[PDB]
Amino acid sequence: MLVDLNVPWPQNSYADKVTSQAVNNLIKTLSTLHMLGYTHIAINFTVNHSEKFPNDVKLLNPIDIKRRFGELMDRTGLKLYSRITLIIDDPSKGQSLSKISQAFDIVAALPISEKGLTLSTTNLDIDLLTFQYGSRLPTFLKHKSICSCVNRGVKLEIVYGYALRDVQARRQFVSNVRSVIRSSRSRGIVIGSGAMSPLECRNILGVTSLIKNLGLPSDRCSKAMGDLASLVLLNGRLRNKSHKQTIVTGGGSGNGDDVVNDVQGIDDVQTIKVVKRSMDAEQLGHASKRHKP
Amino acid sequence: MLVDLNVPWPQNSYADKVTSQAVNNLIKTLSTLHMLGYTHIAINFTVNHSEKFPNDVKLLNPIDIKRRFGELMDRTGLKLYSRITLIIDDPSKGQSLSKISQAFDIVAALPISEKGLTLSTTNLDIDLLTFQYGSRLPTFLKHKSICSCVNRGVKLEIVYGYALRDVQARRQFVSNVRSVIRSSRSRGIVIGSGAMSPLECRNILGVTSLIKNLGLPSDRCSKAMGDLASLVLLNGRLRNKSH
Amino acid sequence: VRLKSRYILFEIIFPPTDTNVEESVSKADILLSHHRASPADVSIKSILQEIRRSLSLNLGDYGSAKCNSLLQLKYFSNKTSTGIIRCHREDCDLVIMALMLMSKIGDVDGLIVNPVKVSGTIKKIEQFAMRRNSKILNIIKCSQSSHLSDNDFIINDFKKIGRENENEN
Amino acid sequence: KTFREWQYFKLSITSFDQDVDDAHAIDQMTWRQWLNNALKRSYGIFGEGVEYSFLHVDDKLAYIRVNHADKDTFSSSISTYISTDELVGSPLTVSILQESSSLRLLEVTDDDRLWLKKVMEEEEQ
Amino acid sequence: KQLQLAMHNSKAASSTRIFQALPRKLRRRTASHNVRRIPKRMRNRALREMRKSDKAHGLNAKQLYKARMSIKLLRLASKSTSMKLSMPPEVTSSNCHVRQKIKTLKRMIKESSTANPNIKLLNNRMGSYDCTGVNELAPIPKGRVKYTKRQKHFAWLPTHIWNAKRSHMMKRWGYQMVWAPTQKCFKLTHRLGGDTCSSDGALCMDSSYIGTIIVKDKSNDSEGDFLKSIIGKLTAERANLRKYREGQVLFQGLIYSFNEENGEDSTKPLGPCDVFWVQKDTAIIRLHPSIYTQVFNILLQHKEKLTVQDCRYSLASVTLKGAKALESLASCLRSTEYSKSFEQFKMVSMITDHNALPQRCTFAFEAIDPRHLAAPKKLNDSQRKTVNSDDILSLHENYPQDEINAVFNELCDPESRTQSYNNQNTLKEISARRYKLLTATPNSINKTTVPFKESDDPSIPLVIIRRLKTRDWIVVLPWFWLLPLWHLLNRIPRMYHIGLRQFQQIQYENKQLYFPDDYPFTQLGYIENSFYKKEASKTKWDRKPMGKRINFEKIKDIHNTKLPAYSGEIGDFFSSDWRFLQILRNGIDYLQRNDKTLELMDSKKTGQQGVRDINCVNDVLEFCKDYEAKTKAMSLSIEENIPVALCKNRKCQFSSSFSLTFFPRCIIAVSCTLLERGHPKDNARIYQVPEKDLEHWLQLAKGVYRPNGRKDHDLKIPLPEVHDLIGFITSGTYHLNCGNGMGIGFIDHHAAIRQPTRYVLIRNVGTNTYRLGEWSKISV
RNA sequence: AAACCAUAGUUAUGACGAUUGCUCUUUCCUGGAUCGAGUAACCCAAUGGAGCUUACUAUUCUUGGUCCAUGGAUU
RNA sequence: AGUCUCCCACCAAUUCGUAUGCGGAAAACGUAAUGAGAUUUAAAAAUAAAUCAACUCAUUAAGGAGGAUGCC
């Protein structure tokens, strides 16, 4: 496939509401990304761990994909997922990842301290680990504590939206990216695009050009926003649709029928799938020995 | 050894003589080049190929290498040579180079226009070719013109001097050097140095990188100031058997 | 794995480039004249600032950011202008380009920055510097009686730069 | 065994609005200031010597040929430059529609490709 | 614990001294901190033995072993601390005192089988005796019961339990010998055991594996004269001459196997030999183990007239190499009386360059138990330092003949060296004797070495000989005495022990051969070449995935013009194939029977009474291809295609008997040095230099320079035909004594005697690069 | 005052060119000639050796087997 | 590559004097035959748990002589 894992939802925190112009800009850039050839699109959210989440569990995500972007999915046939990223600065601050991981589909944490880096690599349920590439990374990246979290269900993300914004941030971007590929041995990495407008978007032939210049080869950079991000989506989606990756609430055969490929068919409010009873006990047990589909 | 073979001689034509301050500057810059590591050096000379060459067989090379610089060929081991840079613009005006062959060791050519450039590679007696990297080379030069001469015993030259004077000349130099490298498929390239002052000279182990990060393979950067520059000098000296 | 490095040993030559001097010609005098000390207006900060200036002009953002990630000035002496700089292995040529295309350090003018050797370990450039100083001292004490160079621009310096600032293991 | 000299592109985009896009870009002298500005912002004076040739510019679908050894430079800079109020108030951009190394692919109902085909072959001269 | 005493101690030094880290050959790593663990099989038996509760009253058939091993189990599990069986089993919780002391030890074993005869205990409290077989072979010496069980097929040397902890072992020829130590020693071996002058140490090798045969006549007349015939037949007429018998100088040469007993007879070389004559009717022979038996039984064909003792289990030897060798050996040897042969040994142990000494330097005397010294000690030699070349000439006239013979004859008699053990001391009683030196009567000496008794202590006969060809020292000693000496000899601060590979390297550097690997004209060298190395190489070759190894039959431009027989390389890929050399050279010679001009191939004449015509050289190559893999890979045949150079002259030769494998082709042994780049490995090929391009190779030898000033290397290398193959290289590596690559090998004899020059071309196996070289003969 | 000693020896193993193999493959006549792509992943010495325990080769370098596993043809 | 074992001084006997299915100087070492078990167990988590394979455990001194089962 072709997948983009980051499109910033315009909002500071749970404090202020969103103006309509930002939403129209989001629609325009979403249509542009579709025009470039992207099938599955994420939508990020940036909150800090040191702030209260609302008590009422229903309002833990205001994206509301099913009824904000219905017509765009009708025409373009796009698939939209929600996502959350949490700022981690100091542990022993409460607000565990129990309920916030319930409403969302992907949970990620970016650390900005030594304690944050220690906490967010061995003893968390996250699936994406990201840094802030427009500043100074908190620690020299140890060669052992990063390669020993890839073997769990965690991956690293590179956002190139910082390489097209200003002049001073480019140096930090280059240095931090070189450090990350050097320390992580370049095994599990995915690429997003924090574009704030249609001008900043790039296609598959114009995202590999930048990254190939910072050390990463071409085939790996193609696999970056390929099946790897699909596996990230799979881990994100197998957390509220199954117990321990053993009993999913999914559907049957036929192309585009999975737990990630099917978004409209599954009633997420009740997590059930009512389907036509077309397969019974008194029918021949083979593919072609029975002919009726 | 190291060979640098584009040190200019302060004289414009056959009329004027050399002053005192010019030779005083030349001696200082020669000493500096000797310090930086170079051992063999050649001295350039520019004419226009359309002027009245002295009729007598002497005083056509006013370098006077054996009286001047006699105290530098000893007390330090560097050796010196002589060359002339003819400028070719017209396909005529005679003065065939059978005359000045005996009075020099290296004969070069500096074509300016298309007719001159196609004449130079057609039939002359030069053993080296050079361009004006300062600005405005006649562009779109292709393998067709250069293949015939480089297949025979001819070499191309880079100067890198114009990269040190001003930014405006630097940009044109870096633009034209890429064209001349890619047109010849990295064959028969040597490096000189246009040192108009005892400040515009440089070492070796960096200029090789300056040519390597422009397109030349690292295997050829180590033979510019080396085997090829030695072979051209060897042939030029062995030409002296005319007598 | 472990990150590689390269160390560059750079000198500063102050050529006379002035008319009406008519110097003598001998291997001793040329070296003794070109190798005068630095006027002490240059510092450890001036060289770094100037080498950063010469990169973001002769190269762009992607040329001034692949070198500025790791570029530190370790040792520099004024009695003899030798200094040592450190950089990544794969991005050392760009620093050399910065070196040549840069003259007129700060306000001081008319000088040449000369990289003389590049090596991986730090233990070996020390031996190279010691051998270089020994070679210079030998060549300055052989042209004639040594004390005809009595001005002592450099003679008392090579011995006394032994390990005073070179204890950076 | 083999040698490659040129690399051919197919690149075209402008500001993603069409209300201002009616002010059509001039043929070449705006597709030449933009590229130089990009190759100067990204790489310095050394990023000026990239020699590129325009082959059959169009309304917007410009075609370019570049040296083999500058593919690293060119494609790295054109993809990271975004102008501002240069020729019009709307910033511009480029998207690389296609890349090739033979000039034998992706052309629709054209006569210009008859040139650049056989008369300008290597000719062994 | 006050630092004031530390300051007082350092007052015997500088203010703040600095100490170096240890040299890397004297460092060790920390082992575990918990006590050792027992095997489970020794735990279960002991547990079940203690848990068990307690018709001539013996009735002990096969139960004697059960009792005699239950006693050991009880003792072990009652003594050792590592034994952690369970909680109940204890010394007193179960009857251990009552058992095996008043139940088993005497009531059961003693009362069933009476002690067998031969209750002659020993003259020692350490098992030490002689194992010699008069006119017959001898078995393994008895010793510890556990470790004599593993020597059913491969014996042990006296020092095996010591070497096994510090080396890599192998198993060949009935011995478990030592191959190489466990550190890299390529350069140290050269500069401590080579012919350099930078030696400040020595190399000692335990060469006990070399047998020893003491043959002697029995006519009772000292003139003998029949052993002379046997020794002159056994080798060439060399080791029975005035130089070797009367002057009794050591001999080193080649030993044959005569069989003259009925009409037609011949001889076939076997290998090296060391023959030493004594009193004109006694001989000592030293042989490599492989050829030990074959010659021995030959002498047994005349034991009616001689007598032989297979004393290889009763005499041991050690070989010493280096400059400071005798200096180190002399630091661990003293005498009983005053003897001139120790005065000479004391004087000559101060040479440091043993090549100056004359042909003969035999020493022989009687030493004391070397365990008295407790530390190696110099010979107070620093006093005398004016040795000149005039006292050396005295060593050729002041030779103690009788004093050597008398001490020597205490080695060729089993009962004499049996008396040599008359009272061998245990370690504790020597310790007590040394302790008794703290209350001596002089009271102003403070001696450390124990005194020596006049008659209540043994005297060890000892012989030292010098080998000139190998340039080393033999020391010959009784077997069971070797271990006490060898323990001191390795406490010298700069003494190193070497294996067998280092011996090969040392003898390679000095331009000399090596019997196992480098004798392709002997019945066992041929086997080691074409049957033992080849399997070891092919087994690791064909057991790699294809493409991750060198392809042998797909190589381009090997020869100037290609014959379609062999697609790629010539001959076997894994060994120096001599059968192909014989067939190819013989066919090339026959192709010039009367048509001088050879010819390579005629384009498709035909395919093939089983006709095999001899028209083209491709036919010879396909004949060689046919003869292999279809005539000797499915059947057996033995022939020696490789003789050695003979003093006589039998060079030339010639539809009845024209086979290409019937006549041996003579060769010679050479050493080739490379004038330019190169690094000849094993099995590389040696070509003659073609008459064409001789000028080009001569010019390359003189030197061709680039305009720069260096040497010119990248030119057009011309190539020779396939019928220019004349030799092989059997050992080659970088030669440190000259700084350039060098190889040793063999070349066809008729090739060298027709060269107009002295150059050859060398190319490895699996490569097409031809390097130049020059060869010089080796007198072997 | 040392004992300092390695055919990689101290956190060095660099920058490039020219041929031949191997795997796949476009057209053909350990078979031969052509058209075009790959030669990876896991990783790196620090006094040495003998063992064991772990990591890897997803039409993305390669080689060999077994299956009372599944689908087809034999019969 | 490692949170792991053994060796790199000797012992005629307060030092593993240990003939123990076979190899080994030794090893948290290798391998052969017969046989049996998996929180209901000698034991693992609350390797296996249809068959074969895998995990773990129990038993088995060498040589030589005598008689017989099977085939020449």
From Swiss-Prot, chain A:
Hydrolase keyword on record: yes
SUPFAM superfamilies xrefs: PHP domain-like
Catalytic activity: Endonucleolytic cleavage of RNA, removing 5'-extranucleotides from tRNA precursor
EC number(s) given by UniProt: 3.1.26.5
Entry-linked InterPro entries: Pol/histidinol_Pase-like, RNase_P_p30
Localization annotation: Nucleus
Entry's Gene Ontology cellular component terms: cytosol; nucleolar ribonuclease P complex; nucleus; ribonuclease MRP complex
EC primary class: hydrolase
UniProt GO BP: intronic box C/D snoRNA processing; maturation of 5.8S rRNA; nuclear-transcribed mRNA catabolic process, RNase MRP-dependent; rRNA processing; tRNA 5'-leader removal; tRNA processing
Record family assignment: Belongs to the eukaryotic/archaeal RNase P protein component 3 family.
Role according to the record: Component of ribonuclease P, a protein complex that generates mature tRNA molecules by cleaving their 5'-ends. Also a component of RNase MRP, which cleaves pre-rRNA sequences.
Record's miscellaneous remark: Present with 6300 molecules/cell in log phase SD medium.
Entry protein name: Ribonuclease P/MRP protein subunit RPP1
Swiss-Prot record, chain C:
Annotated family: Belongs to the eukaryotic/archaeal RNase P protein component 2 family.
One GO-annotated biological process of the protein: nuclear-transcribed mRNA catabolic process, RNase MRP-dependent
Gene3D superfamilies for the chain: Ribonuclease P, Pop5 subunit
Reaction(s) this enzyme catalyzes, per UniProt: Endonucleolytic cleavage of RNA, removing 5'-extranucleotides from tRNA precursor
GO cellular component: cytoplasm; nucleolar ribonuclease P complex; ribonuclease MRP complex
EC category name: hydrolase
Additional notes on this entry: Present with 2230 molecules/cell in log phase SD medium.
Superkingdom of origin organism: Eukaryota
Organism: Saccharomyces cerevisiae (strain ATCC 204508 / S288c) (Baker's yeast)
Coiled-coil segments: none
Function: Component of ribonuclease P, a protein complex that generates mature tRNA molecules by cleaving their 5'-ends. Also a component of RNase MRP, which cleaves pre-rRNA sequences.
Record-linked InterPro entries: Pop5/Rpp14/Rnp2-like, RNase_P/MRP_POP5, Rnp2-like_sf
Principal subcellular localisation of the protein: cytoplasm
Location of the protein in the cell: Cytoplasm; Nucleus
Subunit structure of this chain's protein: Component of nuclear RNase P and RNase MRP complexes. RNase P consists of an RNA moiety and at least 9 protein subunits including POP1, POP3, POP4, POP5, POP6, POP7, POP8, RPP1 and RPR2. RNase MRP complex consists of an RNA moiety and at least 10 protein subunits including POP1, POP3, POP4, POP5, POP6, POP7, POP8, RMP1, RPP1 and SNM1, many of which are shared with the RNase P complex.
Keywords: Cytoplasm, Hydrolase, Nucleus, rRNA processing, tRNA processing
Keyword tRNA processing: yes
Gene name in the database record: POP5
Protein name (record): Ribonuclease P/MRP protein subunit POP5
Keyword Acyltransferase: no
Curated annotation (Swiss-Prot), chain D:
Record-level GO BP terms: intronic box C/D snoRNA processing; maturation of 5.8S rRNA; nuclear-transcribed mRNA catabolic process, RNase MRP-dependent; tRNA 5'-leader removal; tRNA processing
Enzyme class: hydrolase
Catalysed reaction equations from the record: Endonucleolytic cleavage of RNA, removing 5'-extranucleotides from tRNA precursor
GO molecular function: ribonuclease P activity
Pfam families: Pop8
InterPro entries recorded: Pop8, Pop8-like_dom
EC number: 3.1.26.5
Additional facts recorded: Present with 4870 molecules/cell in log phase SD medium.
Annotated localization: Nucleus
Summary of subunit composition and partner proteins: Component of nuclear RNase P and RNase MRP complexes. RNase P consists of an RNA moiety and at least 9 protein subunits including POP1, POP3, POP4, POP5, POP6, POP7, POP8, RPP1 and RPR2. RNase MRP complex consists of an RNA moiety and at least 10 protein subunits including POP1, POP3, POP4, POP5, POP6, POP7, POP8, RMP1, RPP1 and SNM1, many of which are shared with the RNase P complex.
Keywords: Hydrolase, Nucleus, rRNA processing, tRNA processing
Function of the protein: Component of ribonuclease P, a protein complex that generates mature tRNA molecules by cleaving their 5'-ends. Also a component of RNase MRP, which cleaves pre-rRNA sequences.
Cellular component, GO annotation: cytosol; nucleolar ribonuclease P complex; nucleus; ribonuclease MRP complex
Protein name as it appears in the record: Ribonucleases P/MRP protein subunit POP8
UniProtKB/Swiss-Prot annotation, chain E:
Subcellular location: Cytoplasm; Nucleus
Chain segments annotated as coiled-coil in the UniProt record: none
Oligomer status and interactors: Component of nuclear RNase P and RNase MRP complexes. RNase P consists of an RNA moiety and at least 9 protein subunits including POP1, POP3, POP4, POP5, POP6, POP7, POP8, RPP1 and RPR2. RNase MRP complex consists of an RNA moiety and at least 10 protein subunits including POP1, POP3, POP4, POP5, POP6, POP7, POP8, RMP1, RPP1 and SNM1, many of which are shared with the RNase P complex.
Catalytic activity: Endonucleolytic cleavage of RNA, removing 5'-extranucleotides from tRNA precursor
Top-level enzyme category: hydrolase
Name of the featured protein: Ribonucleases P/MRP protein subunit POP1
A single cellular component GO annotation: cytoplasm
Residue positions where Phosphothreonine is found in the record: 441
EC number: 3.1.26.5
Reported function: Required for processing of 5.8S rRNA (short form) at site A3 and for 5' and 3' processing of pre-tRNA.
Keyword Transport appears in the UniProt entry: no
Other remarks on this protein: Present with 846 molecules/cell in log phase SD medium.
Gene field: POP1
Alphabetical keyword list: Cytoplasm, Hydrolase, Nucleus, Phosphoprotein, rRNA processing, tRNA processing
